[PDB]
Design a protein around this ligand. Structure first.
Ligand SMILES: *[C@@H]1O[C@H](CO)[C@@H](O[C@@H]2O[C@H](CO)[C@@H](O)[C@H](O)[C@H]2NC(C)=O)[C@H](O)[C@H]1NC(C)=O
Lengths: 195, 49
């Protein structure tokens, strides 16, 4: 989801919930209100608690290998919370699925949708033969599952910092313009000192 | 001969100034920007570079 032309407050989201995994790599979590970023992107998914750690730059895992590879230069925050109560059920939730295997690795910030049985050879396999194995697999989600197997909901905010004039600016109060005085200035995130 | 010493002086100064706007492994090349985007414990990592 692209988010533009709106005042973004970190504090409301931070006071809202104690997220399970909350970390900003290229940004300070607190300083979000001061700076402006242009064209923030929000990526939403649901993974088991074990998978949450794998969501990080320069980290390899089955999800990272085939599902979601974060850019190594990614700048932004990752927020993740537990969701066992609403998602998991006794009988078993199999809607949430993952690509266990795939013919290659996806590029950073990419989505893969192909639903065809996978072949370790990479050449087409017949479903009966042992070459074909379903890539798209799901974790058996239960209420009795451990917190690692319990579902977790993850939202990744990526900020494009200083690329262009920033449409998305945090909540701050503008002041009057002062000239001929050596003063501090912050022009849409262009912090500096001068006349 | 007089012009060449002036040219070498000017080129030295200009190369010095040009070297300012350059990441040395840091995420950015402006001290202001790194301070704004990073908390001091992880700001010092870039500032030392
Ligand atoms: C859904 O959004 C609401 C509003 O932002 C969040 O509810 C707030 O929760 C905090 C602390 O839990 C309360 O102090 C606020 O009064 C609530 N806002 C209301 C009642 O309007 C809620 O946390 C969000 N749900 C999430 C993040 O899962």
């Amino acid at each position: 989801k692209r988010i533009s032309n709106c005042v973004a407050d970190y504090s409301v989201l931070y006071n809202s919930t104690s997220f399970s995994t909350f970390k900003c790599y290229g940004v300070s979590a607190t300083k979000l209100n001061d700076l402006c970023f242009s064209n923030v992107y929000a990526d939403s998914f649901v993974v088991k608690g074990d998978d949450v750690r794998q969501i990080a730059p320069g980290q390899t895992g089955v999800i990272a290998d085939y599902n979601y590879k974060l850019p190594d230069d990614f700048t932004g925050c990752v927020l993740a919370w537990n969701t066992r109560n609403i998602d998991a059920t006794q009988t078993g939730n199999y809607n949430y699925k993952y690509r266990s295997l795939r013919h290659g690795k996806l590029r950073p910030f990419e989505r893969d949708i192909s639903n065809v049985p996978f072949s370790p050879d990479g050449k087409p396999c017949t479903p009966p033969a042992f070459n074909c194995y379903w890539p798209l697999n799901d974790y058996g989600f239960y209420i009795t599952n451990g917190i690692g197997y319990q579902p977790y909901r993850v939202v990744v905010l990526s900020f494009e910092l200083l690329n262009a004039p920033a449409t998305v600016c945090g909540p701050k109060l503008s002041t009057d313009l002062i000239k001929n005085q050596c003063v501090n200035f912050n022009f849409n995130g262009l912090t500096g000192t001068g006349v | 001969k007089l012009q060449d010493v002036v040219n070498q002086n000017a080129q030295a100064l200009n190369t010095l100034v040009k070297q300012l706007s350059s990441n040395f492994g840091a995420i950015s090349s402006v001290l202001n920007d790194i301070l704004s985007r990073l908390d001091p414990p992880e700001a010092e990592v870039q500032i030392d570079r």
